[PDB]
Amino acid sequence: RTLSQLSFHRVDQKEITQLSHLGQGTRTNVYEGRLRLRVVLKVLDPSHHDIALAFYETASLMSQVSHTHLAFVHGVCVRGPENIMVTEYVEHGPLDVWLRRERGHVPMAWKMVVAQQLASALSYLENKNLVHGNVCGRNILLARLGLAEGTSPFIKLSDPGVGLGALSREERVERIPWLAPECLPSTAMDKWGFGATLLEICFDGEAPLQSRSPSEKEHFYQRQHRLPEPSCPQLATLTSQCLTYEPTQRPSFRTILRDLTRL
Numbered sequence: 001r002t003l004s005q006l007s008f009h010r011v012d013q014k015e016i017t018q019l020s021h022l023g024q025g026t027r028t029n030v031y032e033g034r035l036r037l038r039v040v041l042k043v044l045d046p047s048h049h050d051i052a053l054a055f056y057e058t059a060s061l062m063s064q065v066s067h068t069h070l071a072f073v074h075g076v077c078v079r080g081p082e083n084i085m086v087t088e089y090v091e092h093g094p095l096d097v098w099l100r101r102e103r104g105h106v107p108m109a110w111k112m113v114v115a116q117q118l119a120s121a122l123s124y125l126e127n128k129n130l131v132h133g134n135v136c137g138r139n140i141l142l143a144r145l146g147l148a149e150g151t152s153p154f155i156k157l158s159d160p161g162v163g164l165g166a167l168s169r170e171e172r173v174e175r176i177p178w179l180a181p182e183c184l185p186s187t188a189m190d191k192w193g194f195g196a197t198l199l200e201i202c203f204d205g206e207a208p209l210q211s212r213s214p215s216e217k218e219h220f221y222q223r224q225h226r227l228p229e230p231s232c233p234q235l236a237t238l239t240s241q242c243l244t245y246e247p248t249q250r251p252s253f254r255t256i257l258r259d260l261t262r263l
């Protein structure tokens with residue numbers, strides 16, 4: 001343990017202060033903190049080496065990319081038996097939580113801005129041949145709200161947490177319909193994730209299949225059922241192209257981004 005062949009900044013525990021609990025991610029508890037910067041501390045549960053390795057791989061890869069719409073990763077701290085990823089605090093938190101609270105008065109124009117910013121971030125990851133693997137409204141963080149007159153939203157995509165490759169079948173099923181179908185048993189999976197996230201954003205933060213059970217979610221992919229049409233009709237062609245069960249038929253993010261700018 002503590003791989004020694006990945007590149008990430010090692011944060012000393014004397015440099016971080018842990019403040020309030022914010023929520024949970026997959027096998028993590030996340031806390032507001034300070035880095036002597038306003039940060040978020042993502043404390044991994046006591047885990048087997050394989051899970052910790054997938055956590056450190058995310059930290060290393062997200063430490064070496066840069067983009068206007070990607071949240072910073074500052075490093076990893078080992079505080080006793082706890083691996084803690086130190087990441088950027090994004091002022092207004094997860095998009096899906098805010099959208100549900102503000103449901104009914106978030107205009108379509110606002111959602112198209114967000115879609116375009118997200119597509120831009122994924123276009124960059126595609127060009128670098130890097131998989132995110134956890135594109136969803138929860139992992140879209142709002143840096144600027146953009147509802148007030150003369151303003152516009154600004155989002156940052158959070159890190160994917162513990163790498164998808166290390167997660168259990170039951171955790172993968174919990175991620176339906178954001179999870180690409182081929183992942184239930186490549187950067188193409190993030191096209192599906194993006195498409196599902198557009199449905200979520202259009203539905204003001206309510207994802208399709210939310211009221212279903214794990215077994216029913218798994219059934220949905222098993223029988224290759226069709227996901228719903230978005231409530232922004234101008235996105236219906238785009239979402240249908242991304243939410244295709246065959247991965248090679250999904251369009252590239254260069255095409256997605258171009259199409260969004262014309263919509």
Ligand SMILES: CO[C@@]1(c2cccc(-c3cn(C)c4cnc(NC(N)=O)cc34)n2)CCOC1
Pocket residue numbers: 022023024025026028030040042071087088089090091092093094138139140141158159161
């Ligand atoms: C987005 O999923 C996580 C999560 C869950 C619930 C709340 C927040 C969350 C609430 N607030 C106010 C934040 C401010 N900044 C960030 N920053 C970064 N880099 O995620 C996250 C949050 N995060 C779970 C896995 O990781 C974070």
